[PDB]
Ligand binder design. Structure first.
Ligand SMILES: OC[C@H]1O[C@@H](O)[C@H](O)[C@H](O)[C@@H]1O
Length: 286
């Protein structure tokens, strides 16, 4: 009965709670013994590497890890290759050029976050009337997934000359911070009518601001991940859209990909699940 480790940067997020649950359903279905270990602060890279190497030391059958740093985990991954343990890079993608440099072959599973943001910004751009002033809420500075979604958004508003990015501030993926930041951003420009948030938590924090500010219906918010509560807000109209990243399908493919590599079959180096744009008429399905 093969023993697989899932090593996660956090569980404080609802999104990962969702992925962990889907992970355990796939584990049960495929008769896998599944070992979940979570890092303590979301941003502590060292401790997570700590965790990966432990699993190497325990000679676990496979490891699925959601990295904490695109580069820090490379020596970890090429230690796992030397211990002949297959290993799947989930969610956050390791630096390709850096991986190239060190002779490392590694396998990712996720989504195009650039595309996801492009698709997500584009929908809100259209929603606020191809016109207005937008403000971007970003994740923890540096993380690829966050910046990718930003670059994605930026490309999209660049297509609407009557939409101008007037505010961009990091809310670090936390609801409570995005409420603070959004409030301070809404006072700063009263001509803001649309809010792009790079995850579902900051979108929720951003909606609470506009409704606090008596601005419901007058500023439209987009999010990213597709968590239940975001989806509900989309139903009620409190949100314009979120992008369902399919976190269960992702980690399902991760576990499916580990198993193949345990049985010495080839997997793609990259696998991008196809995200869904979730707005009120696609909301009918959620
Ligand atoms: O932890 C905040 C976010 O981290 C990203 O890497 C994931 O794609 C999810 O959007 C998650 O919600």
């Amino acid at each position: 009965k093969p023993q697989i480790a899932l090593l996660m940067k956090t569980l404080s997020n609802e999104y990962f709670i969702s992925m962990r649950q889907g992970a355990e359903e796939t584990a049960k279905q495929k008769d896998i013994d599944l070992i979940v270990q979570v890092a303590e602060k979301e941003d502590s890279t060292e401790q997570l590497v700590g965790l990966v190497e432990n699993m190497i030391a325990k000679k676990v059958d496979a490891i699925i890890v959601t990295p904490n740093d695109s580069i820090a985990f490379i020596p970890a991954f090429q230690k796992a290759e030397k211990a002949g343990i297959p290993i799947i890079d989930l969610d956050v993608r390791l630096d390709a050029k850096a991986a190239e440099a060190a002779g490392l072959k590694f396998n990712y599973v996720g989504v195009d976050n650039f595309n996801g943001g492009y698709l997500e910004a584009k929908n809100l751009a259209e929603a606020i009337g191809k016109k207005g002033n937008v403000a971007i809420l970003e994740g923890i500075p540096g993380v690829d997934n966050g910046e990718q979604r930003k670059g994605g958004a930026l490309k999209a508003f660049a297509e609407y000359p009557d939409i101008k990015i007037v505010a961009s501030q990091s809310a670090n993926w936390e609801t409570e911070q995005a409420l603070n930041v959004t409030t301070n951003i809404l006072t700063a420009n009263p001509n803001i009518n649309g809010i792009f948030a790079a995850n579902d938590n900051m979108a929720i924090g951003a909606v609470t601001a506009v409704e606090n500010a008596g601005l419901a219906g007058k500023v439209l918010v987009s999010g990213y991940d597709g968590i239940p509560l975001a989806i509900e807000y989309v139903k009620q109209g409190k949100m314009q859209n979120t992008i369902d990243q399919l976190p269960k399908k992702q980690v399902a493919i991760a576990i499916e990909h580990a198993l193949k590599q345990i049985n010495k079959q080839e997997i793609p180096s990259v696998y991008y699940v196809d995200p869904v744009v979730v707005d009120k008429e696609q909301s009918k399905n959620y």
